[model samples]
Target: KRVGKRLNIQLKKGTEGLGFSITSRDVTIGGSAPIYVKNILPRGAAIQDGRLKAGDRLIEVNGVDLAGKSQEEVVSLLRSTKMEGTVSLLVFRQEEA
Candidate 1:
């Protein structure tokens, strides 16, 4: 199906950081691929939170939509704000019709 589900995720950073890595595809070549989770470390913030997972497509942060933005921009945005409540993320996942 063409429809997908959007995920609202709140990440609380631990001593070892968010415990997750992101992977982006084709943003430099005029492609609109959504950024996604690439890996999760055991006992990390992401795994402990129990919502974020591998392959989930990242969409936004703190109510800001990431459409047409490069992955590097998103990474920089995360570092710009270090508040505990500012770690909101919007993601998308496709579902079978």
Candidate 2:
């Protein structure tokens, strides 16, 4: 007989409205916020949108800019918190997606 080890990864699943949804609302240029696109979509946006690509800078979420915020803080704001309503996005793309 052969012996081996097994690993398990348990992921939390939630209802449609019970999960985190982070979106970019606008772009920051010269210390000012300018809304370029609304509803940047999700991970799919990067795949489908011809204007957004990888290595792009996601600048804002809901009115909150991630310029000086730490990665953890930004995640907390996007995941742990809820959006008041519809959100917008500001992103800087390296190439057209």
Candidate 3:
């Protein structure tokens, strides 16, 4: 899909960050959003430097939560905005590590 293609481009280009324009409280995909514990960082890695965890599922940027936004919407927001300020993210982690 086009959304996947765009993500591929960003990934290939080594994009360091992303943003959001709209806020959502929820999203539906294939009728499910499974919840599970996952690693937030590599073993023995110092999490104090703000390095992301190994299994973090980035779920937000800026104040916009991607609970209901489509992939295209999310991508558009990131593309049309400038990166600055605190970009709050909702991530899934296995534990406090």
TM-score winner, 1 or 3 = 1
**Cα lDDT of model 2 by residue, 1-97, tens digit:** 4232222211122212212234333344234332322333443323333444333455665567766564455556545533333334355443333
TM-score for candidate 3:
0.38
Runs of candidate 2 exceeding 4 Å displacement: 1-53
Best by the lDDT measure: 1
Supply every candidate's count of residue pairs whose N, Cα or C atoms clash at under 3 angstroms: 0, 10, 5
**Cα lDDT tens digits for candidate 3, 1-97:** 1121101011111133331122222346523243211433222221332444344444554466654555556556555544342334455444342
TM-score of each model, paired residue for residue: 0.75, 0.39, 0.38
- In model 1, which range of ten residues has the least summed lDDT? 77-86
Model 1 has an lDDT value of 0.72
- What lDDT does the true structure give each of the candidates? 0.72, 0.40, 0.37
Candidate with top TM-score is 1
Q: What is the C-alpha RMSD of each candidate to the true structure, in Å?
A: 2.6, 16.5, 12.1
Clashing pairs in 2: 24-88, 24-89, 24-90, 25-88, 25-89, 25-90, 26-89, 26-90, 27-90, 50-97
Q: Candidate 2 or 3, higher TM-score?
A: 2
Candidate 3, which segments miss by more than 4 Å at Cα?
A: 1-49, 95-97
